[PDB]
Amino acid sequence: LLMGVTKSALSTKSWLSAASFQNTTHVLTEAAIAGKKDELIGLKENVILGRLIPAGTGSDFVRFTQVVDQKTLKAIEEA
Amino acid sequence: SMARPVSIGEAVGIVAAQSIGEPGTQLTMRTQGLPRVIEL
Amino acid sequence: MEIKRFGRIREVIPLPPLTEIQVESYRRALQADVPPEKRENVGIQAAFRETFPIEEGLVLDFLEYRLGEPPFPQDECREKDLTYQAPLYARLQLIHKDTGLIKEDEVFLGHIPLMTEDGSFIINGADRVIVSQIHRSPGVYFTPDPARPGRYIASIIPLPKRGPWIDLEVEPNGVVSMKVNKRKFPLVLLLRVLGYDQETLARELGAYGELVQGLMDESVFAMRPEEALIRLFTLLRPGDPPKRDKAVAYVYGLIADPRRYDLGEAGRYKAEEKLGIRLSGRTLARFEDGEFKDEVFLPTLRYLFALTAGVPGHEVDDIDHLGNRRIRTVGELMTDQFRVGLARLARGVRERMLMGSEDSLTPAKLVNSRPLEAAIREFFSRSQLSQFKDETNPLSSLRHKRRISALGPGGLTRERAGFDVRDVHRTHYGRICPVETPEGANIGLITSLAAYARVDELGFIRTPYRRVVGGVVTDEVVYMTATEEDRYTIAQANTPLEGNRIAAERVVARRKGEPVIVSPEEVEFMDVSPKQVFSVNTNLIPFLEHDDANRALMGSNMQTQAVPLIRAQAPVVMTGLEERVVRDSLAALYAEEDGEVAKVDGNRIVVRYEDGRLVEYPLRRFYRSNQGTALDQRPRVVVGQRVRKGDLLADGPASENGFLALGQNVLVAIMPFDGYNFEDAIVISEELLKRDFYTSIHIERYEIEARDTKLGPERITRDIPHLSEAALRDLDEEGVVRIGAEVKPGDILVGRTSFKDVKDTSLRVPPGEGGIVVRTVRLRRGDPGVELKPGVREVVRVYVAQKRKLQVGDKLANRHGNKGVVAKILPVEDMPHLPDGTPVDVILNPLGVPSRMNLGQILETHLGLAGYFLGQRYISPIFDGAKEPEIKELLAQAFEVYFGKRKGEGFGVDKREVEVLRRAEKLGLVTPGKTPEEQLKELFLQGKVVLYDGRTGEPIEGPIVVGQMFIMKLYHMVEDKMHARSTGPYSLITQQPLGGKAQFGGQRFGEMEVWALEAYGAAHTLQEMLTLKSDDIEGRNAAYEAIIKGEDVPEPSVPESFRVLVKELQALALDVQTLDEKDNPVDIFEGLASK
Amino acid sequence: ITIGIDDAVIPEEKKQYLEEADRKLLQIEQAYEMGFLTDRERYDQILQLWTETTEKVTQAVFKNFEENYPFNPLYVMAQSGARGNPQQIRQLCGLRGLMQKPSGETFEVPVRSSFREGLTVLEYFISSHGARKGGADTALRTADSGYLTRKLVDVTHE
Amino acid sequence: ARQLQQELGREPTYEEIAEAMGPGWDAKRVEETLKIAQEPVSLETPIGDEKDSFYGDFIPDEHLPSPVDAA
Amino acid sequence: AEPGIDKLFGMVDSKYRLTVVVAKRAQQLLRHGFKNTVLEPEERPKMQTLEGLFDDPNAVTWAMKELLTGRLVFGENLVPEDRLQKEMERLYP
Amino acid sequence: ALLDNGRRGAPVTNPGSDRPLRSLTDILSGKQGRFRQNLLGKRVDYSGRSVIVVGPQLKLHQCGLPKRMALELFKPFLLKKMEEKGIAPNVKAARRMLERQRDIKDEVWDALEEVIHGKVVLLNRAPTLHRLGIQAFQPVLVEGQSIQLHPLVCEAFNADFDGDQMAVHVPLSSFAQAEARIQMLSAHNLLSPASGEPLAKPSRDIILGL
Amino acid sequence: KKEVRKVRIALASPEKIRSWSYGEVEKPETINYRTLKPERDGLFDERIFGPIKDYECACGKYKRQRFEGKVCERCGVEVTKSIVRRYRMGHIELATPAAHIWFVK
DNA sequence: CTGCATCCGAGAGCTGAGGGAACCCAACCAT
DNA sequence: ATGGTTGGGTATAATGGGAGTCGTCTCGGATGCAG
């Protein structure tokens, strides 16, 4: 299928971003009828909830990196 | 912006939207022009 | 200084009074000085004569009205926050048809605001201007069918809110149909109601073919007119019981009731001229002898059929034609609101007549005047067309009074209007300025009246033309509308003349806006002046013909924002309109009659006229305008001086010897300078600051109130706890700062204590403000003329003055659209200087010229150089003024002075000048083989001089354009804009920082700022912005505590706005629940909302 | 580097180019008085003639700058890319050219004056139509582009 | 008050209204009565021409402690 | 530009990982009062005021300098966080 | 009417006015609704605004910040630094001293200069059309009321000097400062993200001179 | 405090709405015209929505902390933080059922 | 019985700044 | 024990309302037309 940007954006899985975009009453009533769960995949939902966006320094690829010197690492190695 | 392979974690969707939208403001005149881009 | 003027065009008539569009309109609406027996049927008199008699029996009939004198003068109204108004009394009589008794009484109806001499109003102590509105004229129009070509739609349009628009259209099946109130139905039914037979219609519309066949319907005709009336009523009001008298009343009110339907005088005139018939009144039909009589419908249908049949002499209408658009001025809008109030008063009267005891009733007891006062107050306080008057300088007020708006109540919408209404129509020529308009989203919707234009009694703009007879231009001047203008061939005003005979074989002319070339015999009218094409603001730009229209727009708009200066000068190059502008703004003072001056003071001028009467004119001194600028009048006359009629007595703000003085004439060089004039920036010399150039005076008002509270009254006093005597030095014994004290941010202006046993609630100077306290005003309960709000015991106001010098970040502009912010202030020894030691004052970057194509500033600079060395000023009218050869001759004389001075003292040509002359010889600016003086003169005749660098002493490698330029300081001051906040007040609901510098607010981090933060991948910065700095209450408290304790800020939490969103979604009966990874509820409200 | 009025050099060829045009126009009128041309054909021929005259004037202006004043301020500004494009320079020096009515159709007479020579009142009013149309174009375009950008952000944000 | 204004040809003062009510009425009591008769205004009253500014946008919260106060 | 920014960008596979490492090292330096630094006493970042040169208070500059020296180890799942912090506290109270 | 006013029939209005009452649906939706006005965008603390002036003597990574603006923006840091020094006995005394303009001395400016050492601020010009509309700069304290901007970032900001104003924001924590210094530094953003061509490049007078 | 990972939206039953509410709003009164205090059973009642002042009941018997969760016998106001006035809901019991317009229009 | 075809109604149109109308009478809870 | 507040009562006859708005564009249900 091929649909314009408006209809593609309003048809997403996340009801928070679609509700904050446009046609709020329709999106909200459909999501409430369906009991939709928003999994917070995109950026708009995390911004709305005031969370750390899954991009840049908030990406799971890099945000669990640790840093340590050589002296502290050796002490833990002896332990 | 760095002339090197993109880093993992880059929000390329936002970058794409801004890249398309910036010139359209004022640069693209107004079937032809901005209406053509919007129609497409 | 001698003034020399160019130009060949002689103007037969002077400019009309520039504020007449307001003054004449309101005078005609009020008719205050016309005795009641000779008052016309316009204005509020028409409203009175229409609403009355209030028939019920009892009859209340209007006889006449009068207007009293204002209870308080203008300055008292300004000081006490009152409205400058006059009482309105109407004398009425109650008669009893059955009995006969007549009770006559004069009833007080309320107050009507009065326009001042300058053309503004004083509403609640504030100066206001009513903006004229442009809209579609009422009448009959015919337009092409958009859906299907070859068909036409007829429209009947009454005055706004005075009836429904009526559409007539030939349906594709052949039957004609009339649409009213969104109800399609066949017009033949209503035609039968009006009393038309088959033979009459057939003979009136037989010629035009099959349209009359498609009109025919035997079912409708067979019914008697009354039956047709009932049937039409049941089509128009489905469900409503079809009583005869009910249907009669409804249909009468639809098209035939003068109190409900009203084609205006303009609409009547336009219908009569379009249809070639005679109206009896202002309605589409008349109700006479229990029978409807037609007035407009059949002529409209005839014209429509003839147009559809292609009969010659029938054309469609251009709805943007200025003959089809009209202007509602202040008087008409006020009269419309007055009519609405009068209708509500009539309703109240009728109700009281029904319920009241008819035996003991008088006009006073029947009439409740509250609705009329409410309507007038609403119009003058909440109408979008009633605007806070712009009085930065007198030109600002003059411009504001001549403004025309397409927006407003009943007007167009800025988001839905597109291209059609915003375009410059051909008929705008001489009526609406094509240049002056806002640049943003309001472009083309707000415009200005042309300089010579006049709004006629019907609301149509007229422009003047000279009559030409047999190739001879006469002195007869005819003011014409666009429709009348369309019937002639009009020659341009710059047509060559010998005496008053057209001395040109080929004449450029306009025919219905189309340029044409005609012989002198074919000429019927000629333009009066180029000045008539543009507005007053655009008429003040010299060399306007050398400027692109966009930059002329910028210059015209930017002359309104010029700030009055304490050493303001008139421009070196003027257009010849500055004196009329100064005179017509009523800012300066002029001698009423021939006489002699007796007493002169900084606040008073007493003049002894030849009548022997002494007249004393007080002077307005250091008065705060609506925009904070100080407007004062300074005497320009001496004791014993002889003054003729109209001679200047005192200069107003931004005036120099009666000439408009919005800025300063400065020496400028056009050259780059170390990147400090990069991209519109401006470099200025410290010598400007040394001699108080571009120094302005500004006044700010700080207001406080002591009111009544449940815990005890507030009190303004000096006794304030918990402050040392260093903070209470300047307060007097009454708790108010003393006059003349200097105040800085944090200092107390008025002391106040509130019952907390009391606590400090004093008024202090906000950050970034302060100055010298110049005035204090105290208003207490009971004082004459004071009307405080209930509960407030007293109010104290303090006026504080500032003397602002030019600084980095201030905005300067010339009249050609060149604007820029001061970026660097250099000492005198660093500025480029002439070989005689004179430094320049301003350096402008040449890169601003080529793409803006405003060449008028360059010619202004050349003429300014010539005038600077010749010591004279110039008047150069637009499109007829100084040309290049004249400027070159003046520059030759100026060079003779500028160089003979040096040669007399015993100096030759400098070595640096020789090097520059060599460079210019290579550049091709001078001809090889001439002496150094001849090449220097050639450069001077090109407007260029050898310039030396103040930092090194070496000359600029090429000759540089140098000359005098008129530059104004703009109201955009960095002092009033710089603002910063760490923490402060928060909003009630969202718990987010407030907005605005006045509220000590924070900057808004909007959607695209968030988008940029996301595109950078700066997740932690964005999370900080969205929680720790806006609405995470615990988060922001902890962050501040950690920062002041030296630690790092903690992790953020859920923002309060999301909790507000959850609660508002619950109020809509929607269950929003936050879940963890195992789909179990997570309580974000910390157990404070769970039972 | 500075800008004077004489720095907007008017080429001599322009005068010739104008007379040549004033020649052919007469011819066109003849061809319309003898039935050989329709209204549409004559209108298009006049428009084409004036367009080619404008192009010739542009070429003459820049040839004069290249041959005689290679260090001219406007020429240097345009060639270095600092400020200005050839059309604006032609408007400053050669002639403004043809203008569009509010209906979108061209006028029959062009503006034969440059900004250095100074326009007449009628020519200024005629150009005001295009100036106003460009301003209104900008005003609507900015809003339409903002709305489009918001839609794109909403569709690609994830 | 409306009858007094009709008679006087101008807005009456509070003392005149107090005199016209009868015994047991002074200007202060009239002031209190006018004070308690004031009807609240809407937090959603539009300020300015554009549909972007409401009255409640200009009202600060005075209940919750500020970050400085909490510290 | 920041000194050695090209080297820092070349030391990691993703620039956001470099940002995360720098921020975490700055937090570590701030928490222990710059006593856990890997810089020699003559590589310490200095700041010039009227009284004289003192230590640079900006921990992010210290973190970038330390990353430049190459004496810091960074990666995924190097040491448990609790044990890491306890050991750091043991060496530097 | 309570749930969605102005949807079926004539909207409910308050007497004496034509203004429709604002229902919950009106609160939720629109440009002024909760989502677009308070959730996807907020007003923030530690921010300011001022007119911009050309900064030709600045380096690529530097911006000129007014002294008063900087004092207001970094106020808690300045209070802590004043506590560390002998300027004030306690934070409350430092705040009271900083409250009145005429009560400020000389050493507080040196303390402020020590406070901002190495830190960066965010400059932003509306409208923000691309990410380059926000950039990080090291502040140099200047006199006056105007922000000084480097000439080479004007094209990225679409900024000129005919009255333009810009907003200033302060990243607070170590993570925010690291992100601003590494990712959003002006000297680190030299090529266009849209085309890959240089975006900070000579223009106007620089091209003319060369 | 568990991390939030998903947000769900669904229809609310009358039982759910009644479990949300801390009491039924029975009167249209907002505040008293003399004392500017909330009216009992009104739209601002402290018995339903919570106290205006922190740790202080309506009648002033208790004005101190440690009484969290304790309801004053005379006035019926719980002793807790006043911030609960922006979280605690009420409800109106309709005499007849009404349709939610979102699902109609 | 299907299909397409106008027809109606519903939801949109950049950011930032600044902008403010009856009267009377008697019992009864609250303070 | 006082004022403030609240419930009840008035008897010729009365019997269906009233303001308003016509200068915007695009897209998805739906009733109407034909085959």
Ligand SMILES: Nc1ncnc2c1ncn2[C@@H]1O[C@H](COP(=O)(O)OP(=O)(O)OP(=O)(O)OP(=O)(O)OC[C@H]2O[C@@H](n3cnc4c(N)ncnc43)[C@H](O)[C@@H]2O)[C@@H](O)[C@H]1O
């Ligand atoms: N009801 C009514 N009746 C009559 N007239 C009415 C009216 N409503 C509106 N108007 C008209 O609206 C205009 C009011 O002026 P405004 O445009 O409101 O403001 P200004 O005083 O000109 O200041 P500004 O700072 O915008 O100036 P400039 O463009 O030089 O500033 C340059 C810089 O400012 C910034 N800027 C300007 N406009 C911007 C915008 N829209 N968005 C963002 N930034 C903007 C940019 O950084 C830019 O580079 C008048 O022409 C007036 O006639």
Ligand SMILES: Nc1nc2c(ncn2[C@@H]2O[C@H](COP(=O)(O)CP(=O)(O)OP(=O)(O)O)[C@@H](O)[C@H]2O)c(=O)[nH]1
């Ligand atoms: N978001 C908006 N910004 C605007 C609007 N109007 C003006 N502006 C801003 O103000 C700027 C005004 O630009 P100017 O007209 O001065 C022209 P610019 O500097 O772009 O070009 P040159 O004249 O070629 O030097 C514009 O670029 C925007 O940054 C508007 O309606 N919306």
Ligand SMILES: [Mg+2]
């Ligand atoms: Mg503007």
Ligand SMILES: [Mg+2]
């Ligand atoms: Mg610019």
Ligand SMILES: [Mg+2]
């Ligand atoms: Mg600008």
Ligand SMILES: [Zn+2]
């Ligand atoms: Zn209690």
